[PDB]
Amino acid sequence: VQLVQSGAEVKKPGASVKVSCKASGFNIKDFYIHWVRQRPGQGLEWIGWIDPKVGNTMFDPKFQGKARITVDASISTAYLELSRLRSDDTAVYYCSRGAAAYWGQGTLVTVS
Amino acid sequence: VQLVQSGAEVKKPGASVKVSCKASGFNIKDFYIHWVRQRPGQGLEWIGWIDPKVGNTMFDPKFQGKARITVDASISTAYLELSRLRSDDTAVYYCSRGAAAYWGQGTLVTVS
Amino acid sequence: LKPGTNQFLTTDDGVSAPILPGFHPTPPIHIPGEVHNLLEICRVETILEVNNLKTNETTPMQRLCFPVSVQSKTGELCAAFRADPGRDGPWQSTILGQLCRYYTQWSGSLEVTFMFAGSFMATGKMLIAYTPPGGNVPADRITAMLGTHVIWDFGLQSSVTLVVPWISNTTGIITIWYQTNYVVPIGAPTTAYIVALAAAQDNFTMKLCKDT
Amino acid sequence: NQFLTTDDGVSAPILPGFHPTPPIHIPGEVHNLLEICRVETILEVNNLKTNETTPMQRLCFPVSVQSKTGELCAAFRADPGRDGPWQSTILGQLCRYYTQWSGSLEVTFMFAGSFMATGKMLIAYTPPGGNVPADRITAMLGTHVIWDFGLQSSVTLVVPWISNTTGIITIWYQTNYVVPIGAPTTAYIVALAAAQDNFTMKLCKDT
Amino acid sequence: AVVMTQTPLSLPVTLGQPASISCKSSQSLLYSDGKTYVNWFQQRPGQSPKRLIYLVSRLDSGVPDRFSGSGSGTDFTLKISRVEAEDLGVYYCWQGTHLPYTFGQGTKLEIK
Amino acid sequence: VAQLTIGNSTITTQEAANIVIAYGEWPEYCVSVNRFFTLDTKSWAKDSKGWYWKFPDVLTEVGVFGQNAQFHYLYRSGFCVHVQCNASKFHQGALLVAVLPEYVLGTIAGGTGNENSHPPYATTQPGQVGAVLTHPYVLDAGIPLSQLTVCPHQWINLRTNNCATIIVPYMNTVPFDSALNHCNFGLLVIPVVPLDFNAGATSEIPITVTIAPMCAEFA
Amino acid sequence: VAQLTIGNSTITTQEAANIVIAYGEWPEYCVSVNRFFTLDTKSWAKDSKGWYWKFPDVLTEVGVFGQNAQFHYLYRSGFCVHVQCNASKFHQGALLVAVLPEYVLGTIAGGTGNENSHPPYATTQPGQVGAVLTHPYVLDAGIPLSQLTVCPHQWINLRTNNCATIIVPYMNTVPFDSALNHCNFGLLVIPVVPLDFNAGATSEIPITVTIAPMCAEFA
Amino acid sequence: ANIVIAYGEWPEYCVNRFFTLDTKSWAKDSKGWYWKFPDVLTEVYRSGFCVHVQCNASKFHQGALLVAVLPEYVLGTIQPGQVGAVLTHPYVLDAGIPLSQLTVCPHQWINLRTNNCATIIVPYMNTVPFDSALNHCNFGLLVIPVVPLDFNAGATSEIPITVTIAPMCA
Amino acid sequence: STQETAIGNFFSRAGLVSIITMPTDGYVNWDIDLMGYAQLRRKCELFTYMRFDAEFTFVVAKPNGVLVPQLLQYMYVPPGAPKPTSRDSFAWQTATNPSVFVKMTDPPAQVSVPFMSPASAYQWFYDGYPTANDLDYGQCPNNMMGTFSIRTVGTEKSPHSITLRVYMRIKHVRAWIPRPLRNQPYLFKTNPNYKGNDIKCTSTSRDKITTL
Amino acid sequence: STQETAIGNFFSRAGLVSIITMPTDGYVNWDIDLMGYAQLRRKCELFTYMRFDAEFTFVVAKPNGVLVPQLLQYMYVPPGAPKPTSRDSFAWQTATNPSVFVKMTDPPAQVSVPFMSPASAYQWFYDGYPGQCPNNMMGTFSIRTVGTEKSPHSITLRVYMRIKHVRAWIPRPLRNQPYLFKTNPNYKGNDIKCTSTSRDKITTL
Structure with a gap:
């Protein structure tokens, strides 16, 4: 059971990207899927999780507007759609079911 | 430039699956993306292509109802959604931009 | 002698003994401009501060108007601000937003007018779009027109009015989209400014007095 | 110069400039508490000692084919203030907030068996200060109705007067339970109780 | 707007001596329900993070039982019996009581 | 037999005037919505405990009742429910259909997923399929079933009748509200007398719910 | 100045009765749709050749005009167009706005992609942004521009006026039709006299199109 | 015919010539001017006033002015007569009144795109019906360039502003 | 009566x-x-x-x-x-x-x-979340009468310790939409939770249904 | 209302x-x-x-x-x-x-x-000279103990004040700068605190 993700991206300010998170083995509609961030040279942060059964999605106050989590049951993905990027949004992003079981590799994004 | 795809799937009759086709390097909104099939021990077949600019999708008469091609511009995918599978739909599926440049690896599906 | 007597209530009225009973004060004289209700004050147009950038505390005279120019492509937004007179931001600078600090709850409808200030030879169109509360800011122009909007043309009139339907106690977002690019002939200036104004309608009322 | 606890009077308002929200008509306004004591609520006649584990069975008492004709099936007193079955109804909970009550009551039953069942039962009520009957033939001599659950599924019995030794209501078997092949064997009877128009309560006290 | 603090910077350690990393909060992290909720995560330089402690003092498939944790109410701590080489990395606090989930400042383990 | 049809749907109902109007007030006021939305069929087993649906979240996903009105989201609506249980003449049992306004389910369920890594939150919008009750005797709140009949209710006795309709008006402190946050009332269906049938017959009796709004305003 | 508003939108137009009714027939018949949908602004450069939009595909994606009516898809509608060009008093040029019914573009374009592995197909639904013409003198068909004025038309001369409105009724052999397949008419805007301006001024003059349907029936 | 009457009261009762002041030149970086009224008249009782402000500019200039009267205008630490006086920090006028809320007083906008005339009729406003003139000043007229002037190079650099006062039966 | x-x-x-x-x-x-x-x-x-x-x-x-x-x-x-x-x-x-x-x-x-x-009226039972779509967790409404605050008058501390009781009447009541009572013991001050494992039944008990 | x-x-x-x-x-x-x-x-x-x-x-x-x-x-x-x-x-x-x-x-x-x-009315703003202050004063109060020698009890008091029968006659703009004295509307010259708060970009939400 592992969560594999997409590759890195290089973008410009004001754009909108969406990273992906593959599920494998375990069913996608059971666990919450959290999303965390790490600015380079800064401690781990948190964005928000998603309830895949009905669609409850809730975010940290900071990124209230910017972020958007969606889930697909057929291909078993979990997307995090950022929007209106600034120079502060260069970081590695991870998707992890609950906290313990597994996490995925880092996906660095570049806005410069 | 290569088209990587999803893994194999084992399903039951009457279900609906969707394979995926990753783009890489080249832009997704320029070329047509065809989809072909190979029943085991049978010659190559054809399902239908998609015009990614506006959304023109057209299929072979045979699978007129069953199939459904969609494209996503953000994550650069190309999905082929089959539906109402019978015992005849066990085959390898490939996605290829135009015919020549590249094709992707085979994705075998199982309905038994 | 019931309970509740012998106390000093702060907000109680009543007749108190006058200190100078023989005194007859000066009779009034008609002077113009008597105000009875505070809602006469909240119905005049005052300047909004839409261009409240972080680089304007040094020279604050530029904070009153936001610019338009020829170096901007068509279809992109120009400015955006929320519509709630109680919070911080642009509504602190108007007479409505200062008299709403002094009350807790308010409701009613508002109106926002703009005024072009360029030369006589300039021409172009801009789209004033308003999204209702609990919605989302539009991503581009084609999703903004589908809501409530007016199309301001500053080659015909120099001032247009946009009315906000209802606010109470997530709020609305007003956006200023470019419809066409700025058109000027030889000799006219390049950039121009737009000054904004805001006041309330007749059905604006407040209650539950508080202190700032 | 005293703070009597239960005295009324005009007291000085804390916010004289405040004008509160005007009312809006919302449905269901209740003026007297006797509108609440006139609706039928479930009794708990089968309050045995072996039901604290699964309390859903406490709402209905059974009838069966293994019972001979003319044997008492169940019984209960009629006073909403004391303990026992009357604690579970809305009348018996609002009578804990008062001291003296009087008036007339009504108790309705409702059969819940299959469509093919037939038989008769005798609902007998003894007045206060009398005695519980020993068998059926001394029970029919008093006030009683003969419920037949092959014709109607709900019958009503009215209690004449209670005040502040009380009445005893008995459910006698008149005929045995009759069922065809394929029908179920046992059936349940759910009871209901409410008050009449002349029920009043007259002094306030806490529970 | 809860905040967390950790014992600062790094406790230089050697092969076999305890570390005693501490984490202190601003308000009690006990939910209405009986459970109190904290977690500790460890990330090795160059890999995704992993969960170490469950609830306040329980372990989940972490073979070394060296990691023991303890505490309640305002303060929490992790006492390790013997720090092996594998244990080098960074350490964080995660808290679940209030809505803005908080991740800790982050400390370092170093050799002397 | 009566084929009641309004708009697009068509349903069959008995010729019985056994309707009950909640609190004696018809829904009074001040095109493609006034139709019978019939929900999923719930199967009544031998040891089931009861089901509940909340309103007006029950018509949010299916249907367009709560479609964002891009002008403003002020709505005000009543309803007309229909519960019916198609059983034979050899089954027996009794149901209790009642609408209780402003229900709050204290009980908590784990929900779909956590790893003791957030407090497990609770779901209070069952939506389309509804949800089973946990402890009936208390109705997932402290209220006793016994006294549930103080609200608007109707009995479904399988011996006599298989229909129960309740007309419920709008009941809230404010005349209009934002829909997604609120939930006005809850319909409950509780098997007070359990089902029984001799072996060999059908094991699950079906239950069908039909909803019809009464002039949901948007002005 | 006149603030014409109908429904939700509000636009400003001159007080000129220079309207032209196509073939002398008002659109006669037998709520949230009668509003001014204003399209994207096309920039008129110094060497541009012309633009065209097809109808009623122009309001299919944007808007809900062609929303599937789940009953049946019989529709019948007219239109009211508005072309305006905001230029200064030092520019010069002339436009020719005309609606030609039943246009067929013989010319073919490669389209977005092929590898000489299917015959390159052609696009005839420009949709929202329109599309540039290739050879104006023939209008992508053999028709000569010269004679384009036999259809309903209006001149936009930058010396005098900057507005041109055409009222076009419904024109088809059958009274109703399936929308997606068909396309009734095409609006064309062709710079017959080219733009000129002395160096220093603005280089691109804008063009704004505004559409308003006239009681699109669905019955 | 765009006159504005201050507080809706015409000056009623119980020298009549247009005194025109000196012309003030509006530069590219000017901050604004103000005249205390009884005093201006003095160098050149119960009385009204009538003030006209006009700016003769071309159709290729751009800018906006805000003419507003203000009763009992008292200033921050610094009686100007004909010439007037400049402002020190425009944003706060000189008493911390925010410019933004100046429009609560009687006012009129001078936008160079549309109109170049603004007249305000102001009645007598004081606690006593009569007073002395050399000590007291009733109101102050303010002209502040809220939107700055701009022009392309080669045109005239200074746009003129002319004020004309006319008494109303003193 | x-x-x-x-x-x-x-x-x-x-x-x-x-x-x-x-x-x-x-x-x-x-x-x-x-x-x-x-x-x-x-x-x-x-x-x-x-x-x-x-x-x-x-x-x-x-x-x-x-x-x-x-x-x-x-x-x-x-x-x-x-x-x-x-x-x-x-x-x-x-x-x-x-x-x-x-x-x-x-x-x-x-x-x-x-x-x-x-x-227009108080609500002792609110079904939703305090916040269009749900945004945060909680099952409590927004109704309150504000706090009282008691202190001694002066600058330094009083010599004496004081205690007080607050009595409260309610007047002019009106009510709407009656509901069932509560039998389970309470657990918190804001939410209607109950003890899960053991449920106290409403009535007392007897040994046989046919007892007097 | x-x-x-x-x-x-x-x-x-x-x-x-x-x-x-x-x-x-x-x-x-x-x-x-x-x-x-x-x-x-x-x-x-x-x-x-x-x-x-x-x-x-x-x-x-x-x-x-x-x-x-x-x-x-x-x-x-x-x-x-x-x-x-x-x-x-x-x-x-x-x-x-x-x-x-x-x-x-x-x-x-x-x-x-x-x-x-x-x-006939109080003036909070006087333009002329009587100085830039008017002549409005409502007297002063004088508080003392009664007796000849000093009372051995230090006292403190507070004075509350209501305002009755208000009428107002011309409106004016508010004040944003902090005050400096009790009689004249001076303000701090070098730094001026702008009325509003600030954001970083005009196109932010």
């Missing part, structure tokens, strides 16, 4: 809602809620929409039962205004908050407060 | 205007003052001509808030009469300056004073 059982005579009696002790910070901020002593709670729950104003009374004496003059002050904050945080904070001199000034040796104070909900 | 925002409700509620401390000369001459605490000042200046009478109330206690049965006198002088200068001066026996005599254990005193301007 039938008047004794009316809605008016069901809530008319006064009863203490809280006990406040200030021994030797110097101030306390007692929140207002009918809830907080159990008996009343269940009574109120009889209905789901209530509307009423209150009338408070404060009796004060030393813990020991003797009196000593010490002017006190009972500052009342309306909903939305900021609460005091120290004995010498800025809030105590705010005009908008009314207060009474009474002596310990005097008869007890009496204050009436009108209902200040933004809606 | 519209009655809550009227001019009568916007100045009705009372507030303290001064704190007077007399520890162990024996008297104090508190002048009348409305520009004394800041809050009222802002509110008051919303207009330039006001007219109102007041209603005062003096609550008195020891600094630790314990009452002592001791006598007081709150002498009130009108505008124009000379103020007292010593504890045993000649002014304290003058009949034309009214005074109240209240004990400390009594309920607090309450006095209303009508507006005594020679003009």
Whole structure:
């Protein structure tokens, strides 16, 4: 059971990207899927999780507007759609079911 | 430039699956993306292509109802959604931009 | 002698003994401009501060108007601000937003007018779009027109009015989209400014007095 | 110069400039508490000692084919203030907030068996200060109705007067339970109780 | 707007001596329900993070039982019996009581 | 037999005037919505405990009742429910259909997923399929079933009748509200007398719910 | 100045009765749709050749005009167009706005992609942004521009006026039709006299199109 | 015919010539001017006033002015007569009144795109019906360039502003 | 007669809602809620929409039962205004908050407060979340009457420790939409939770159904 | 409704205007003052001509808030009469300056004073010279104990004040800069605190 993700991206300010998170083995509609961030040279942060059964999605106050989590049951993905990027949004992003079981590799994004 | 795809799937009759086709390097909104099939021990077949600019999708008469091609511009995918599978739909599926440049690896599906 | 007597209530009225009973004060004289209700004050147009950038505390005279120019492509937004007179931001600078600090709850409808200030030879169109509360800011122009909007043309009139339907106690977002690019002939200036104004309608009322 | 606890009077308002929200008509306004004591609520006649584990069975008492004709099936007193079955109804909970009550009551039953069942039962009520009957033939001599659950599924019995030794209501078997092949064997009877128009309560006290 | 603090910077350690990393909060992290909720995560330089402690003092498939944790109410701590080489990395606090989930400042383990 | 049809749907109902109007007030006021939305069929087993649906979240996903009105989201609506249980003449049992306004389910369920890594939150919008009750005797709140009949209710006795309709008006402190946050009332269906049938017959009796709004305003 | 508003939108137009009714027939018949949908602004450069939009595909994606009516898809509608060009008093040029019914573009374009592995197909639904013409003198068909004025038309001369409105009724052999397949008419805007301006001024003059349907029936 | 009457009261009762002041030149970086009224008249009782402000500019200039009267205008630490006086920090006028809320007083906008005339009729406003003139000043007229002037190079650099006062039966 | 059982005579009696002790910070901020002593709670729950104003009374004496003059002050904050945080904070001199000034040796104070909900009636049961779509977790509404704040008058600390009780009547009640009672014991002050494993049945028990 | 925002409700509620401390000369001459605490000042200046009478109330206690049965006198002088200068001066026996005599254990005193301007309304803004201050004064109060030698009880008191029958005659803009003095509208010259808060980009939400 592992969560594999997409590759890195290089973008410009004001754009909108969406990273992906593959599920494998375990069913996608059971666990919450959290999303965390790490600015380079800064401690781990948190964005928000998603309830895949009905669609409850809730975010940290900071990124209230910017972020958007969606889930697909057929291909078993979990997307995090950022929007209106600034120079502060260069970081590695991870998707992890609950906290313990597994996490995925880092996906660095570049806005410069 | 290569088209990587999803893994194999084992399903039951009457279900609906969707394979995926990753783009890489080249832009997704320029070329047509065809989809072909190979029943085991049978010659190559054809399902239908998609015009990614506006959304023109057209299929072979045979699978007129069953199939459904969609494209996503953000994550650069190309999905082929089959539906109402019978015992005849066990085959390898490939996605290829135009015919020549590249094709992707085979994705075998199982309905038994 | 019931309970509740012998106390000093702060907000109680009543007749108190006058200190100078023989005194007859000066009779009034008609002077113009008597105000009875505070809602006469909240119905005049005052300047909004839409261009409240972080680089304007040094020279604050530029904070009153936001610019338009020829170096901007068509279809992109120009400015955006929320519509709630109680919070911080642009509504602190108007007479409505200062008299709403002094009350807790308010409701009613508002109106926002703009005024072009360029030369006589300039021409172009801009789209004033308003999204209702609990919605989302539009991503581009084609999703903004589908809501409530007016199309301001500053080659015909120099001032247009946009009315906000209802606010109470997530709020609305007003956006200023470019419809066409700025058109000027030889000799006219390049950039121009737009000054904004805001006041309330007749059905604006407040209650539950508080202190700032 | 005293703070009597239960005295009324005009007291000085804390916010004289405040004008509160005007009312809006919302449905269901209740003026007297006797509108609440006139609706039928479930009794708990089968309050045995072996039901604290699964309390859903406490709402209905059974009838069966293994019972001979003319044997008492169940019984209960009629006073909403004391303990026992009357604690579970809305009348018996609002009578804990008062001291003296009087008036007339009504108790309705409702059969819940299959469509093919037939038989008769005798609902007998003894007045206060009398005695519980020993068998059926001394029970029919008093006030009683003969419920037949092959014709109607709900019958009503009215209690004449209670005040502040009380009445005893008995459910006698008149005929045995009759069922065809394929029908179920046992059936349940759910009871209901409410008050009449002349029920009043007259002094306030806490529970 | 809860905040967390950790014992600062790094406790230089050697092969076999305890570390005693501490984490202190601003308000009690006990939910209405009986459970109190904290977690500790460890990330090795160059890999995704992993969960170490469950609830306040329980372990989940972490073979070394060296990691023991303890505490309640305002303060929490992790006492390790013997720090092996594998244990080098960074350490964080995660808290679940209030809505803005908080991740800790982050400390370092170093050799002397 | 009566084929009641309004708009697009068509349903069959008995010729019985056994309707009950909640609190004696018809829904009074001040095109493609006034139709019978019939929900999923719930199967009544031998040891089931009861089901509940909340309103007006029950018509949010299916249907367009709560479609964002891009002008403003002020709505005000009543309803007309229909519960019916198609059983034979050899089954027996009794149901209790009642609408209780402003229900709050204290009980908590784990929900779909956590790893003791957030407090497990609770779901209070069952939506389309509804949800089973946990402890009936208390109705997932402290209220006793016994006294549930103080609200608007109707009995479904399988011996006599298989229909129960309740007309419920709008009941809230404010005349209009934002829909997604609120939930006005809850319909409950509780098997007070359990089902029984001799072996060999059908094991699950079906239950069908039909909803019809009464002039949901948007002005 | 006149603030014409109908429904939700509000636009400003001159007080000129220079309207032209196509073939002398008002659109006669037998709520949230009668509003001014204003399209994207096309920039008129110094060497541009012309633009065209097809109808009623122009309001299919944007808007809900062609929303599937789940009953049946019989529709019948007219239109009211508005072309305006905001230029200064030092520019010069002339436009020719005309609606030609039943246009067929013989010319073919490669389209977005092929590898000489299917015959390159052609696009005839420009949709929202329109599309540039290739050879104006023939209008992508053999028709000569010269004679384009036999259809309903209006001149936009930058010396005098900057507005041109055409009222076009419904024109088809059958009274109703399936929308997606068909396309009734095409609006064309062709710079017959080219733009000129002395160096220093603005280089691109804008063009704004505004559409308003006239009681699109669905019955 | 765009006159504005201050507080809706015409000056009623119980020298009549247009005194025109000196012309003030509006530069590219000017901050604004103000005249205390009884005093201006003095160098050149119960009385009204009538003030006209006009700016003769071309159709290729751009800018906006805000003419507003203000009763009992008292200033921050610094009686100007004909010439007037400049402002020190425009944003706060000189008493911390925010410019933004100046429009609560009687006012009129001078936008160079549309109109170049603004007249305000102001009645007598004081606690006593009569007073002395050399000590007291009733109101102050303010002209502040809220939107700055701009022009392309080669045109005239200074746009003129002319004020004309006319008494109303003193 | 039938008047004794009316809605008016069901809530008319006064009863203490809280006990406040200030021994030797110097101030306390007692929140207002009918809830907080159990008996009343269940009574109120009889209905789901209530509307009423209150009338408070404060009796004060030393813990020991003797009196000593010490002017006190009972500052009342309306909903939305900021609460005091120290004995010498800025809030105590705010005009908008009314207060009474009474002596310990005097008869007890009496204050009436009108209902200040933004809606038309109070709700003891709210189904949704406090926030279009749900945004945060919770099952509590927004209805309150604001806190009271009690402290001694002066600069330095009082020599004596004081305790007080607050009694409250309810008047002019009206009610709407009746509901069932509560039998399970309560567990918290805001949500209707109950003990899961064991459920106390409503009635007592007997041995046989045919007993008398 | 519209009655809550009227001019009568916007100045009705009372507030303290001064704190007077007399520890162990024996008297104090508190002048009348409305520009004394800041809050009222802002509110008051919303207009330039006001007219109102007041209603005062003096609550008195020891600094630790314990009452002592001791006598007081709150002498009130009108505008124009000379103020007292010593504890045993000649002014304290003058009949034309009214005074109240209240004990400390009594309920607090309450006095209303009508507006005594020679003009018809108060002026918070005067342009001319009498200086840039007008001549509006409503007298001063004078508080002392009653007796010949010093009372052995230090006292403190607060003065609350209501405003009745308000009327206003011209409106003006508000004030954003902090104040510097009690009589003139000066402001800090070098730095000016802009009224609004700030954001980083104009196109932010």
